[PDB]
Structures are given as structure tokens and as C-alpha cells.
Amino acid sequence: EFMALAYSNIPLGATVIPSPFQVHISDEQIEELQLLVKLSKLAPPTYEGLQQDRRYGITNEWLANAKEAWKSFDWRPAESRINSFPQFTYDIEGLTIHFVALFSEKKDAIPIVLLHGWPGSFLEFLPVLTSIRDKYSPETLPYHIVVPSLPGYTFSSGPPLDVNFNGEDTARVINKVMLNLGFEDGYVAQGGDIGSKIGRILAVDHDACKAVHLNCCYMGKPSSIPDAQWFATFGSGYIVEHGTRPSTIGNALSTSPVALLSWIGEKFLDWAGETIPLETILESVTLYWFTETFPRSIYHYRENFPPPKLRHTEDPRWYIRKPFGFSYYPMELVPTPRAWVETTGNLVFWQAHEKGGHFAALERPQDYLDDLTAFCEQVWAG
Amino acid sequence: LAYSNIPLGATVIPSPFQVHISDEQIEELQLLVKLSKLAPPTYEGLQQDRRYGITNEWLANAKEAWKSFDWRPAESRINSFPQFTYDIEGLTIHFVALFSEKKDAIPIVLLHGWPGSFLEFLPVLTSIRDKYSPETLPYHIVVPSLPGYTFSSGPPLDVNFNGEDTARVINKVMLNLGFEDGYVAQGGDIGSKIGRILAVDHDACKAVHLNCCYMGKPTEEDKRALARAQWFATFGSGYIVEHGTRPSTIGNALSTSPVALLSWIGEKFLDWAGETIPLETILESVTLYWFTETFPRSIYHYRENFPPPKLRHTEDPRWYIRKPFGFSYYPMELVPTPRAWVETTGNLVFWQAHEKGGHFAALERPQDYLDDLTAFCEQVWAG
């Protein structure tokens, strides 16, 4: 049905008109989730499950309380809030690609694509979009904001069943979202986590991406610098498992929503600088559950197995020549000093922050928006 | 029960034990098997060579077979073997045993690993009582459940627990049975680490045979072995890192659904074996783990290597085996180790290589396993 929505006017010059989209999880799925949460079994007490500092992962107490709270979690109000933002799909290379957008009425608004990672989603950027739409009407908005679901995530389909799919494929498909919207003349990319790999690939390989801002630069100490990571030794189990046995873990965590909550909840707890509320965790895990995201979402991790000859960020093949900005958040998983980041591209913008961790947009929306705006205004050349 | 007479000289009488899972536990299992949801089709789940783990089709078929799986006959077979428990350091320690009537029978402890259990050794015990009566049996065979596994309780809730603790507790099973004058240990997987610790640190353990020597390097077969070891190190060690760094997360996640546990453990029975392990055997092991809440209690050993020591356990002079040491090479072990490697880790007096068999040597090749065990004990036992 036709639904007028503010900020939803497709930019002049779009070559393909996207299909309007709204989230409508069925009543039967909501009923089922409540049942499956209730009946999920909990592990018995163990020494590891009793460590309140989470040294061995989530605690039994956290999970029991989360299970109890999930019983009274109501998806419908969250879904209504999601549906207050314009959403669309395109069909690209046989994939359905979902995206949230705020479109400006200005002919020459600066197009920006914001790229989530794992175990996130477009939800990470909704607080930022709220700030944007409160400050700007469609008529005063300086930017077009596109927040796509990567292939395999939430309402995006795929990846394909019959061929391998990697970060370069991901970037090619996301670039086509921007091309379809008429942004061949230029857009800015912003990324964290896996989205920072995608954003780097867009900037290095795709003409339409003119500049890139990252809040994550997964790297070791660069070899070109002559003469703290609890993450490589203790925090990388999920990477090895996702990268070597994605089918096993995907099959395992499809069985019960509480299995999925255990695996993903650990990361929302440990990776954030600002504490992420339980409701936010439940919202994201619930969305992953309804859309069967997890098994489809982990294809990127196998690019690290066997270990590449050079890390992606440390490879001249992926050095960013276009204008490159970086924001340093102190509770990022591998915080990278400016001298490190500078070895990986033409770094024209640097901003450090006193607060915030891995989920920068979700934890510190105003800092994230201030940085993004400042970067685009500094580098955009018309 | 034949083979159940406690050896003379035992200083603690063990308590007889039988498995009797309640109908309520059986039906809770079937409820949660039926409640489990399947993954969507994925590229990774369609790879028949299992390059990314189990296939979705294997899991769906295994779940369907589980709905028709009858625990009662498997339980009756378990209960056909003498079983006991001891209370040691506040833990209930379960064990299977075959006791000889010979007064000076050689005592042997067989040590399972993860994701195994005493079930791994039941084919060997079957071969033993088919070959020997209680009067001709040359050995006392003890097959304990490690702390945290199946019918053994623990590990403690309030303190850390490691391989040296495991070895100390297992040694006390043998001491309780009167074997302070000497026993032989045999181990694979984690049981190979326990066996090494017994031999190095515990007076009563007089010799040790291993079918696993997790180590790095200190011809065509050596080439095929190196390729397998590299595959295991590069692609097979996710479970080690996850168990070793986030045991509470994975323990909680897989406890929620028996089919989650089946996915995680089934992958290993498929990939680690040389001889194909029947689905029924996988279901029996995973079912036993489920009824006893084994998985979250069973993975404490993995964190010993985080952070990694500069010297792996087998390669550390602190753990060099000076007592008589035997090794059997099975080509589909996870890190197949040539003799020149193994010899650097102990007083290797016995070496046997096999054409067939992988990681679960006793379960896959019970006759080879028993032949090696008899040959090693006869070679090294000194009264």
C-alpha cells in the first residue's frame, strides 16, 4: 500500500527506484519466540559460569536474568520505531538488499553510506539517524544517509548458496545500492568492524566512493614503523570458530534463541565502552533470530584462514589514496594509534575521544555524528 | 557380575554403580530435540566435504534419527560392565572396571578425552572379556570418568581445576584399589596429558602408553602426516580457542538445546576418526553428555594453554617421561607424530604404527588398541 513517509523521496538522478519496505514480523513468530525462550535449558552452575568479571564469558546469572527479561520483551514497539525511518530494498545480483535511508530534498546533498558489522546491524545507526532527523527537515538536510543491511544480515538475503562470497563481493553489491540511487558522481563511506573492511574496499576499488571515514582499523604494529590486545589471545575465539567452522556454529546457534543470545550477548557486554542496555541487546538478538541472520552473517571471517600474507589494512593493495578519516575510540577492540593508521592511507582527518568503544555510533551517537559531519564538510569538494 | 571382584589389597571399597536415567530425563531430551530449530540453507552448510563444519543435511538427519533413538538398550549395555564410584576430594568419581582373579594381575588405567568418555573403551572391554575369563585375565582394567565428565561430578565451583588436579584425583582411584605398587596408564587426547602427568609426577604410575602426543616439530607418510597436522592447526582448532577462552559462553550456549550440543560434538566424531563412527555411537555419546550436563563441566582443561607457554606440555623438560614410555601411531590422529618427534618427549621403549585408525583409536580399532596394550604391558611390566 502507498505510504507517504518523510525523508523518503528518491533522489533525482536515481537509475533504479527502490521498493518501499517495512518490517512486519508475523504474530506466529512472536508467539513462537516466547515459547522457545521459556523452554530453553540453562547450563548448571560451573566455576566458569560463576565468574562475575566475565573472564570466561557470560555469567550464568546474566543469562538467567536475560532469559527472564526476554519473556516480557515486546517486539512491536521496537518494530514501530524501526518503521518510522524510510526503508527500501533493491534486487542486486540476485540478492535482496535492505536499507534504511534519510533522503534530502537538496539536489547536491552529500551522499553517505554507513556500514555496520557483526553482531550488529542497521539498528546500530538508528540513534544517529534520530539526531539527524531532529536537527534537519528533508529540506534542510545536507546529506543523503544510506544504512544498508550487508548481505546475510536481517532483511537482506543471501549470501548465495552456490558460490563463495567475500568482502570484495560485499563492497561491489553495496556500491550498486549507491549507484542505483544516482550517486555515481560521488559518496562518502563510513565503517566500523566488518564495515570498516567494506568501506576500505569501496574507497580503494570503486570510483563512486570518494572518501572514507573509519572507526576501526584491524591491524598489528605496522612493519614500516621501526623501533594492548587482550583481544588476540583471549578475545578471538569467535573469529577462529566463525572463520573455520561457520556451518557448525551456525547450525548450533539456530537451535534455540537462548543459544544465540549467549554467543552474541558476550560481545555487547565486553566490546562496549558505554554500557549497552539489556533491552538493546535483546532487540538485536531478537532481530537476528527472526531473520535467521547468524548462519548467513559470518562468511567474512574465513578470509583470515589460512592467515593472509599481509593483513588487509597492512597491504599496499588496500592502502587508501582518497581522503581518509579516522576516529579513535579508547575501548575499541584493538585501539590503533594515529601513527599506525597513517601507514594504511592518506589520513587527512583524525579525531580521538575520551569515551566510547567498539559500537561507536550506538554508544556515542553525538560524537559519531559530529565526526562524520566534520569529516564530510572537510573533504567534500562538490 | 563377572569381573567385579574388588582386588585384594584395595584400601577403599568402591560403591557399586548402575546407570538409571529417569523417564522424565528421556522425555525432556525428546521434547527439546523436537523443539529445536534448523538453520536456513547456507553455502557453508552445503559443502559435502565439511570444509566449514557439519552439513545442514547431516544435522537434520541426525536430529530425525535421534527422535527414534532408544536410550534403554544402550543403558543396558553400559550396565553389563562392572561400574563403581569413589568419593575423592569431595568429587564423585565414576569408573568402569574389569577385575582379574589373578593376584598379581597388571593394573591399567585407560584415560578418555573430549568429547569422549568411558563409552570409547567399551568395545575394548568387550574384546577383553571375550578373550579372557576372570581367571585368565592378565590385567585389572580401570576406565574412569574424568572430573566433569558423565557420571563423575565436579570440577569444583569455587576454585580453578587443571590437569595436575585431574591426575592427582585419578591416581587416587588406583591407590584406593590397592595399586600403589604399580600400574600402567594409557591415554589419548586430554587423557594423554593426564597419562604424562601421572607418569612424571606420581610414584604408583610405573609406565605410560600414549596414542596422542600434541606437539610441534622438535617420507610420504611423514608428508601426509604433516599435512594433517597443519589442517588441524589452521582449520581444526576453533573449539580449542573457544573452550580455552570463553568456556562459560560456549557452555551456556550449547546447554540450551541438545541439537546445539550435537552440532558441536558431531563435527569432531566425523572429522577426527579414521574409521567412520556410526551415527548411533555419536547419538549415544551426545545423549550421555546431555543427561549428565557434561559439556559445560568438561572443558576446563582447554584454558591451560591461554596464554600459551613457550614450551608445549609434551615438549617441556618438566614433563619428560623417564619411566617406560610407549607410543602407538594412528595415521588419522589429529597431529600424527613420527617416532623421532615422540622420542624427544620421553624414554620411548615401545613404538607401533598402524595402517588404519584415527583419533578415537580404542573406539575405532579396538583389536589394534588391545593388541598394543597387551604388548606394551608385557614388554615393560617389571613386577
CB neighbours of residue B269 within 10 Å: 24
Strands A187-191 and A143-148: unpaired
Among A242, A233, A229, A238, which Cα is nearest to A265's? A238
Residue A172 grid coordinates? 561491489
What is the spatial distance between Cα A363 and Cα A356, in angstroms, rounded to a whole number? 6
Residue B86 grid coordinates? 569413589
Q: What is the widest separation between alpha-carbon atoms in chain B?
A: 61
Q: How many residues does chain B have?
A: 383
The closest CB to that of B45, out of A59, A235, A250, belongs to: A250
Under a CB-based contact definition with an 8 Å cutoff, are residues A167 and A113 in contact? no
What is the spatial distance between Cα A334 and Cα A337, in angstroms, rounded to a whole number? 10
Q: What is the 3-state secondary structure (H, E, C) of chain B?
A: CCCCCCCCCCCCCCEECCCCCCHHHHHHHHHHHHHCCCCCCCCHHHCCCCCCCCCHHHHHHHHHHHHCCCHHHHHHHHHCCCEEEEEECCEEEEEEEECCCCCCCEEEEEECCCCCCHHHHHHHHHHHHHHCCCCCCCEEEEEECCCCCCCCCCCCCCCCCCHHHHHHHHHHHHHHCCCCCCEEEEECCHHHHHHHHHHHHCCCEEEEEECCCCCCCCCHHHHHHHHHHHHHHHHCCHHHHHHHHCHHHHHHHHHCCHHHHHHHHHHHHHHCCCCCCCHHHHHHHHHHHHHCCHHHHHCHHHHHHCCCCCCCHHHCHHHCEEEEEEEEECCECCCCCCHHHHHHHEEEEEEEECCCCECCHHHHCHHHHHHHHHHHHHHHCCC
Partner-chain contact A41 B255, CB within 8 Å: yes
In a 3-state reduction of DSSP, which class is residue A265?
helix
What is the spatial distance between Cα A168 and Cα A234, in angstroms, rounded to a whole number? 29
Under a CB-based contact definition with an 8 Å cutoff, are residues A121 and A265 in contact? no
Residue A71 grid coordinates? 519473556
Residue B74 grid coordinates? 544402550
What is the spatial distance between Cα B20 and Cα B8, in angstroms, rounded to a whole number? 29
Q: Identify the active-site residue in A153, A218, A301, A329.
A: A301
Catalytic (active site) residue A193:
yes
Under a CB-based contact definition with an 8 Å cutoff, are residues B290 and A73 in contact? no
End-to-end CA distance of chain A: 37
Under a CB-based contact definition with an 8 Å cutoff, are residues B170 and B163 in contact? no
The answer, for B263 touching chain A at a CB cutoff of 8 Å, is yes
| Alpha-carbon dihedral sign for residues A312, A314, A315, A318 | positive
Catalytic (active site) residue B20:
no
Among B84, B111, B44, which Cα is nearest to B263's? B44
Amino acid at A143: Y
Chain centroid to CA A122: how far? 6
How deeply is B238 buried, as exposed, middle or buried, from its count of CB atoms within 10 A (0-12, 13-18, 19+)? Answer: buried
What is the spatial distance between Cα B146 and Cα B316, in angstroms, rounded to a whole number? 24
> CA dist A52 to A57, A252, B5, Å?
9, 26, 47
Partner-chain contact B235 A42, CB within 8 Å: no
> CA dist B12 to B179, B182, B198, Å?
11, 17, 20
The closest CB to that of B53, out of A247, A253, A306, belongs to: A247
What is the spatial distance between Cα B258 and Cα A40, in angstroms, rounded to a whole number? 10
Catalytic (active site) residue A312:
no
What is the spatial distance between Cα B56 and Cα B311, in angstroms, rounded to a whole number? 39
What is the spatial distance between Cα A63 and Cα B250, in angstroms, rounded to a whole number? 12
Among B103, B166, B175, B167, which Cα is nearest to B139's? B103
Residue A170 grid coordinates? 560485499
Partnered with residue A92 across adjacent β-strands are A95
Among B373, B331, B305, B288, which Cα is nearest to B115's? B288
What is the spatial distance between Cα B229 and Cα B157, in angstroms, rounded to a whole number? 35
Distance from CA of B185 to the nearest CA of A (A): 28
Find the Cα–Cα–Cα–Cα dihedral B158, B159, B164, B165, rounded to 10°.
-30
Residues ending a continuous segment of chain B before a break (C–N > 2.5 Å): 218
Among B210, B241, B371, which Cα is nearest to B303's? B241
Angle between helices B258-271 and B23-35 (to 10 degrees): 80
Residue range of the domain that includes B273:
1-383
In a 3-state reduction of DSSP, which class is residue A321?
strand
Phi, psi at residue A38, to the nearest 5°? -55, -45
What is the spatial distance between Cα B255 and Cα B297, in angstroms, rounded to a whole number? 11
- Name the B residues in 266-285 with CB < 8 Å from any A CB: 267
Amino acid at A115: L
- Do you find a cis peptide bond into A119, omega within 30 degrees of 0? yes
Contacts B267 to A, Cβ<8 Å? 245, 248
DSSP-assigned letter for residue A324: E
Residue A67 grid coordinates? 532469559
Residue B91 grid coordinates? 568429587
> CA dist B367 to B119, B222, B273, B302, Å?
16, 25, 16, 30
Q: What is the 3-state secondary structure (H, E, C) of A356-374?
A: CECCHHHHCHHHHHHHHHH
Backbone torsion region of residue A156, taken as left when φ is above 0, otherwise alpha when ψ lies between -120 and 50, otherwise beta: beta
What is the spatial distance between Cα A41 and Cα B296, in angstroms, rounded to a whole number? 13
Residue at grid coordinates 533493491: A90
Give Cβ neighbours of residue A109 (< 8 Å, ≥ 6 apart). Answer: A11, A103, A141, A142, A143, A144
Chain centroid to CA A28: how far? 28
Angle between helices A60-71 and A257-271 (to 10 degrees): 120
Q: Experimental technique used?
A: X-ray
Give the burial string for B139-175 (b: 16+ CB within 10 Å, else e).
Answer: bbbbbbbbbbbbbbbbbbeeeebebebbbbbbbbbbb
CB neighbours of residue B209 within 10 Å: 29
Among A243, A95, A102, which Cα is nearest to A169's? A95
CB neighbours of residue A181 within 10 Å: 26
> CA dist B146 to B113, B118, B173, Å?
8, 9, 11
Phi, psi at residue A286, to the nearest 5°? -60, -45
Under a CB-based contact definition with an 8 Å cutoff, are residues A249 and A118 in contact? no
Among B27, B32, B149, which Cα is nearest to B91's? B149
Q: How many residues does chain A have?
A: 382
What is the spatial distance between Cα A370 and Cα A368, in angstroms, rounded to a whole number? 6
Domain count, chain A: 1
Phi, psi at residue B23, to the nearest 5°? -55, -35
Helix (H) or strand (E) holding A169: helix A167-180
What is the spatial distance between Cα A191 and Cα B279, in angstroms, rounded to a whole number? 45
Under a CB-based contact definition with an 8 Å cutoff, are residues A345 and A324 in contact? yes
Return the CATH number at A226: 3.40.50.1820
What strand order describes the sheet that includes A345-352? A19-20, A87-92, A95-102, A143-148, A110-115, A187-191, A209-214, A320-328, A345-352
What is the spatial distance between Cα A125 and Cα A118, in angstroms, rounded to a whole number? 13
Under a CB-based contact definition with an 8 Å cutoff, are residues A155 and A112 in contact? no
What is the spatial distance between Cα B234 and Cα A76, in angstroms, rounded to a whole number? 44
In a 3-state reduction of DSSP, which class is residue A273?
coil
Top residue of A56, A239, A333 to mutate, by most chain B CBs within 10 Å, is A56
Specify the long-range contacts of residues A316-319, CB closer than 8 Å, at least 24 apart: A317/A204, A318/A200, A318/A201, A318/A204, A318/A344, A319/A204, A319/A344, A319/A345
Under a CB-based contact definition with an 8 Å cutoff, are residues A278 and A73 in contact? no
CB neighbours of residue A129 within 10 Å: 23
In a 3-state reduction of DSSP, which class is residue A328?
strand
Give Cβ neighbours of residue B135 (< 8 Å, ≥ 6 apart). Answer: B100, B101, B102
| Alpha-carbon dihedral sign for residues A354, A359, A361, A366 | negative
What is the spatial distance between Cα B43 and Cα A160, in angstroms, rounded to a whole number? 7
Distance from CA of A320 to the nearest CA of B (A): 30
Residue A173 grid coordinates? 553489491
CB neighbours of residue B312 within 10 Å: 15
Contacts A250 to B, Cβ<8 Å? 39, 42, 44-45, 53
DSSP-assigned letter for residue A291: T
Q: How many H helices and E strands in chain A? A: 15, 9
Under a CB-based contact definition with an 8 Å cutoff, are residues B107 and B131 in contact? no
Residue A91 grid coordinates? 534486487
Residue A84 grid coordinates? 518510522
Find the Cα–Cα–Cα–Cα dihedral B14, B18, B24, B28, rounded to 10°.
90
What is the spatial distance between Cα A35 and Cα A39, in angstroms, rounded to a whole number? 6
Partnered with residue B321 across adjacent β-strands are B346
Give Cβ neighbours of residue A231 (< 8 Å, ≥ 6 apart). Answer: A333, A334
The answer, for B231 touching chain A at a CB cutoff of 8 Å, is no
Give Cβ neighbours of residue A163 (< 8 Å, ≥ 6 apart). Answer: B43
Amino acid at B90: G
Residue B147 grid coordinates? 572430573
Among B93, B89, B127, B125, which Cα is nearest to B110's? B125
What is the spatial distance between Cα A148 and Cα A132, in angstroms, rounded to a whole number? 17
Give Cβ neighbours of residue B363 (< 8 Å, ≥ 6 apart). Answer: B116, B119, B120, B121, B123, B273, B277, B281
What is the spatial distance between Cα A58 and Cα A25, in angstroms, rounded to a whole number? 29
Give Cβ neighbours of residue A1 (< 8 Å, ≥ 6 apart). Answer: none
> CA dist A328 to A107, A356, B323, Å?
33, 9, 57
Find the Cα–Cα–Cα–Cα dihedral A328, A333, A337, A343, rounded to 10°.
-100
Find the Cα–Cα–Cα–Cα dihedral A206, A211, A216, A221, rounded to 10°.
90
- Do you find a cis peptide bond into B41, omega within 30 degrees of 0? no
What is the spatial distance between Cα A255 and Cα A242, in angstroms, rounded to a whole number? 17
Partnered with residue A350 across adjacent β-strands are A326
**Residue B54: closest CA among chain A residues belongs to which residue?**
A248
Under a CB-based contact definition with an 8 Å cutoff, are residues B67 and B30 in contact? yes
Give Cβ neighbours of residue A179 (< 8 Å, ≥ 6 apart). Answer: A15, A208
| Alpha-carbon dihedral sign for residues B156, B158, B163, B165 | negative
- Name the A residues in 289-318 with CB < 8 Å from any B CB: 292, 295-296, 299, 302, 305-306
